[PDB]
Scaffold this active site. Sequence first.
Site, short mmCIF file in Angstrom:
data_model
loop_
_atom_site.label_atom_id
_atom_site.label_comp_id
_atom_site.label_asym_id
_atom_site.label_seq_id
_atom_site.Cartn_x
_atom_site.Cartn_y
_atom_site.Cartn_z
CG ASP A 1 6.82 -4.53 -4.51
OD1 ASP A 1 7.68 -3.65 -4.72
OD2 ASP A 1 6.35 -4.77 -3.38
CE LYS B 1 10.83 -4.27 -1.23
NZ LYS B 1 9.54 -4.39 -0.51
N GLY C 1 1.33 -4.79 3.76
CA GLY C 1 0.44 -5.94 3.87
C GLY C 1 -0.96 -5.71 4.40
NE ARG D 1 -3.12 15.10 4.99
CZ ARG D 1 -3.45 16.21 4.34
NH1 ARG D 1 -2.71 17.31 4.45
NH2 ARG D 1 -4.55 16.23 3.60
N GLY E 1 0.69 0.60 1.23
CA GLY E 1 -0.75 0.77 1.34
C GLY E 1 -1.45 1.43 0.18
N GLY F 1 2.67 -2.50 -4.53
CA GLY F 1 2.93 -3.93 -4.35
C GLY F 1 2.45 -4.86 -5.45
CB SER F 2 3.47 -8.34 -6.21
OG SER F 2 3.39 -8.81 -4.88
#
EC number: 4.3.3.6
Lengths: 274, 274, 270, 276, 270
Positions: free
Chosen positions: C19, C76, C148, C160, C209, C230-231
Amino acid sequence: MEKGTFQIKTGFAEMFKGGVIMDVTTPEQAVIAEEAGAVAVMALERVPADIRAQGGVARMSDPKIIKEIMAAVSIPVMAKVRIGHFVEAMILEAIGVDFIDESEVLTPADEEHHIDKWKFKVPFVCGARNLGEALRRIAEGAAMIRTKGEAGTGNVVEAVRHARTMWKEIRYVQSLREDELMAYAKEIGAPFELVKWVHDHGRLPVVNFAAGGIATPADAALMMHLGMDGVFVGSGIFKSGDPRKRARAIVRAVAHYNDPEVLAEVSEDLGEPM
Amino acid sequence: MEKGTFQIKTGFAEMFKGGVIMDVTTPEQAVIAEEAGAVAVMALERVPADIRAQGGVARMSDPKIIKEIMAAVSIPVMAKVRIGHFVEAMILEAIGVDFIDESEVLTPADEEHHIDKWKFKVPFVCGARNLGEALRRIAEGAAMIRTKGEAGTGNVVEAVRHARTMWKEIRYVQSLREDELMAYAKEIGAPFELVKWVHDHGRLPVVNFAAGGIATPADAALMMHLGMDGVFVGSGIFKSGDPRKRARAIVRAVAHYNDPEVLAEVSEDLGEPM
Amino acid sequence: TFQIKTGFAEMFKGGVIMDVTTPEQAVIAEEAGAVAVMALERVPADIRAQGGVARMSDPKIIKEIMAAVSIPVMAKVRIGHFVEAMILEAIGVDFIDESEVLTPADEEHHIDKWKFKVPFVCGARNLGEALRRIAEGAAMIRTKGEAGTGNVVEAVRHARTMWKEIRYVQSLREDELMAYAKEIGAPFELVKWVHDHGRLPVVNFAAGGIATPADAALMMHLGMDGVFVGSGIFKSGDPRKRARAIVRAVAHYNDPEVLAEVSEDLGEPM
Amino acid sequence: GGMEKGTFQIKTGFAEMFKGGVIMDVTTPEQAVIAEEAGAVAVMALERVPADIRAQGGVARMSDPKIIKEIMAAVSIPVMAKVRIGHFVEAMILEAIGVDFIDESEVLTPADEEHHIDKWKFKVPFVCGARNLGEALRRIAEGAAMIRTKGEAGTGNVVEAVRHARTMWKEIRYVQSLREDELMAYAKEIGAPFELVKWVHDHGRLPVVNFAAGGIATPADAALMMHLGMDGVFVGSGIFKSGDPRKRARAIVRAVAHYNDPEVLAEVSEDLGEPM
Amino acid sequence: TFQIKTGFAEMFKGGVIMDVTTPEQAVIAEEAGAVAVMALERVPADIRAQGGVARMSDPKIIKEIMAAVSIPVMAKVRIGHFVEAMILEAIGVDFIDESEVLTPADEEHHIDKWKFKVPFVCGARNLGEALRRIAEGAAMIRTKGEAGTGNVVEAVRHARTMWKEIRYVQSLREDELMAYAKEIGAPFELVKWVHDHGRLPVVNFAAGGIATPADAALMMHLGMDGVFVGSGIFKSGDPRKRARAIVRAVAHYNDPEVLAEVSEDLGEPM
């Protein structure tokens, strides 16, 4: 590191694969079953289904009648004991039966514990509705498993459910990652070491028969298509027109379960079912 | 961008459009049905509605009885199998029946899975109460659909509900935007590809008959007005006094469902129903 | 007959998609070894956490990122907002992420992705969801994971779960497939496809995550084809180091020594 | 008809060297040295206190290898480190850098809420937490080489450690007391691997070392756990924030080594300052 | 055969035991007429109210109090913490209070008091609880009352309840004792003992919420053998006065004139 060990009572029921085991209440029926091609007979003094329907207590059969059946045929003879009644098992073993069926069809003698089958030389067959139950019975020493199906109805629906369920779970266990086995074992209440065994082999370590509700040759063949090693059938066979014909019909259907022509032939003019 | 392909058992029941298929238990009844104008007969050794009423198990009929019926008429002969009992189906196919009805009126042999109909050459007809059910049966290989209606009551109310519901849903699917089809497919648990097919065609890909509770000529004609391709009627015709008359009456009512004069004529002095 | 939008994401296998909110971050990501970047004007998690509405980013910012790197650029759109998708396609993005992290524009319908030339990536928590998205036209799938938080637990669950179900489907008898498809609300034809192949017909990435090199490698061991990150990489302290660390961890996911090496003195994560 | 020979293992012999000792959480080389000089049998390397991170609502993960290596180079006794439940890659890393023991800890943020680490795939031994016998045996069946009570974290309240210690022992002694024909029903009841239940029945103890952990705040608490049948204790870094880090650490070590000596316990408890 | 640890608390009958946190307070309590002091490093109620864990006090503080007075000194341990008890016994305390005011160390088991030479006092809200504690070895009982409120209402309830049950047991037919014992979860042999004697086999004190001279005298009228009072005496303003007032109130519990006298100009309570 310490090396632990455990056993699995294997090789005792392989001789029955592809065969039919029939319930019999008299030496005469035992003779008919053997002539029809049964691989073994299940000796009964009285039909358990009839006893429970009357609200009575079904127990181990009198040794006298079991012995009479043993003397009438050359094929293996099995007999039943109430769940957890290890003394009834001691008696059956003493008189020489070839296999003991710790049966839920008889009135349970212990609602918490099954028989410690490792304490016996004679092999036991136990019922199961799913993999967890099957593995718990095997961990106790069972040498053969059978579906519980549905007793006293002639409806094959539950046998089908149990057969399909046990196999779906077996194939699932084989498909799981090794690191996912413990969580699944806990989920179904199955002994862990046996779950690992099933994961590695993709099958049960002992012979697995269909039982309960098998009323027609079509039903018997259906169970074979569902991956079962053979079938147990009730004495209802000797309660209709020509018992010899339906008995032979089921034996033939199990032996040629993948032959539509044979299945149709043995199903014709078979008379009234149970 | 890979491309897949699916099949649909089409063109097997179109010969029955505008006709009546009658339940028969004897060759004599089959003859009456054929002479009356039935487009096919449904062979039964015993009325499943009677067996359920007695709390018994209803299964595939004995091949002997089915063959006798097959030898008595020239029109197609159908027979029933329990839901999920693919071996009973193997047997019916082997003896040469023209169509198999995987019937909910017989005692289900598998409460989780229906027959994998693609594994058979003989066509199957399955019941449905709505579009989702109809499409799941078709996805499994059904070559014909019928309403489930209500059995053993002679009350047409459920057949009406099923017929109206399937059509309301078919026309609704056709009315939906292409981008709203997935959500609806999920809603009714219907196979997405078939929902798209219905959206484009505005009908089911196979013949759809009314069944269960059609007791009078008026009932039969009513189902045709509700968009059904024909009707299945029970053996009740051969017990409601002068079976020949009511049989011919229903055939004529279906053939002239939009003619009040004809409907009134065939309904007059028809005798006691069922 | 039906189709499956295959062949569009294979180029990303074994890689990391990052990101980025600025052209500078995009350059850092590319130099670090990212196989693609996800352009964002603002972090959806931040907006959502602030109770605001997260939508498609301004074309101006996306264009600035596209002109700063040579690797593919994704962007997005809100679930079901096919017009936002029309816009992203028009400006030339290489891939569109119909994202649950943005505020859903349609609570009932996802985008009819077959109506677009540009490929789409969609999130999934299980096989049924993945197959429904693929049936709609998705050319790539990713776990939804948890956004987040920096907690990899949900990505692990989704990875899984999708695989347990894929292998289960492959293990099922052909006559048991319809009942299962109905059970998980999955398109029947695709279930049969998975039964025959034992995998998804499109690339499946881990996302949501993944905060450390160990997390990224973990996802590869769980059978994922790559990871989205993520960024947070450009805030932890040393962007170039953590970014390069995650890229190297994915490329050497089965080498304990390298994993230990790239994890050392990596500062503090998000 | 015969008997197929089935086999399974138990990772024994890895934690015996810790019996009768104290393992201390340390966040710096300086604390590690203090722990070793106080008599700790091992140290648990932490980059940051998990309890604090959790209370702050953050995610607690494996510590940076840099800090773990710094601690390893400061002491001679064994060094342990933690990984999140199910995070086998964090475990691969700790094993690679040479830690002596890995604690798959519920104190860190679980990475897998369904599966624990397949510990058999590692050479390095693992210690896992348990609140009862069933949990302990499941962890051992997965390959755990040591068990510890879960106790209660971040409170300094010993009540849960006491419950877990007493519960595990009540169940172990009960299993030993049961008839052989009653073991399967009990194993099912507690969700314990059957073959290990049979092992416990024959031996009357856990197959691996069992330590107390979580909420051990005073010398009295540590000695209490030994009286309850535990093989040693794990204590938090709170020792390094009381007043006299050396005195506090030494007090716990001596309390465990002499748990049945009231006089020693009274001696080490005097003028010890406030806990944590 | 069984035992009852009798004879250890009789010396306290008709007296007041005071909580003290310092040697100075201990001296004030002794000079006031207290029959014993309860040494505490910190008020459990304060710690508990602050959400902290209340444990055995540091031996250093207990020893300092022991060296300041000649009267018996008691100290507390957490419920079930038999090692804390081993320590208090080793340092020479005269009595141990296994107290519910401290944070319980064992939620299932109380201390096996028979394993100690030093006597124990335990709290109880009814006869069943009192007899269970006595069966475990307790040599003295006290009401649990209510701690940290200054409200005597619960001490009154406990005192009246224990006595209603004691007198009821004495009134029961011998053939009705087992059913009652089972009903209140009380040791059968002790129930029979109470039936024959009409009292507890050990001294029973009031405790928890006794804030005024009137409260203390009230407890004596309710059949208690004495009272335990909190360190609030040394904060209300004049420690020596309120302490002496409570001691005198207990000694003259049936004299309205004296009770009125010691209650006058007593400042303000806790």
